């Protein structure tokens, strides 16, 4: 699992040569489609996606294809002739409370991050700016702001959602997740 998921886990950030990921993202299409959190990219003048390879980190410019503001998601497209290993959208699954999940990300240096945890709720609200997002998952697999925008997966490596790190009233990092089904239904006008 920790061998076959990371290639589809990317870093997302601005276009500066000396800039690193400020969030994570999930490759969901062979021609370079990436799902990430909307608030992470919406104010970036230019978007660069950082991809792990056997030769080290490669960067690709990306454009926003579609915003999903009501769920704080963005669909990006990398501008490249290259093909990518990716999450299969047909393999997307739901999870239930108590089920073990794994939250993947990439840090500011391009290194992979993974944490496992349990689903703790399957219906939780979250406010992102002025948007009230509903029917999110909660899990303790999300421990770092750097995991935001990265994928939640089940033990089989199926994409189950996109993570959002939120702050509690006390500063404790709390883990939220947009269910992957939201991607499918809000993107039935692209690929
Ligand atoms: Cl929406
Ligand atoms: Ni919706």
Author numbering: 34 to 224
Paper text:
Here, we characterize a protein called MamO that helps to initiate the formation of a magnetic mineral called magnetite in cells of the magnetotactic bacterium Magentospirillum magneticum AMB-1. Two genes in the MAI, mamE and mamO, are homologous to the HtrA proteases, a ubiquitous family of trypsin-like enzymes that functions using His-Asp-Ser catalytic triads.
Although the MamO crystals grow in acidic conditions that disfavor metal binding, they could be soaked at pH 8.0 without affecting diffraction. We solved another structure of the protease domain using crystals soaked in NiCl2 at pH 8.0 and identified a metal binding site. Overall, the conformation of the protease domain is highly similar to the original structure (root-mean-square deviation of 0.17 Å over 184 residues), and it contains the unidentified peptide. Additionally, a single Ni2+ ion binds between loop LC and helix 2, with H148 and H263 directly coordinating the metal. MamO’s di-histidine motif is highly reminiscent of the Zn2+ binding site in another trypsin-like protease, kallikrein-3, in which Zn2+attenuates protease activity by altering the position of catalytic triad residues H57 and D102. Taken together, our biochemical and structural investigations show that MamO binds to transition metal ions using H148 and H263, but that metal binding is not restricted to this motif. We conclude that H148 and H263 contribute to a metal binding function that is required for magnetite nucleation in vivo. Interestingly, H116 and D149 participate in a hydrogen bond on the opposite face of loop LC from the H148/H263 metal binding motif, suggesting that the conditional phenotypes could be due to temperature-dependent flexibility near the metal binding site. It appears that binding is insufficient and that the precise coordination geometry must be maintained, leading us to speculate that MamO directly promotes nucleation by guiding individual iron atoms into the magnetite lattice.
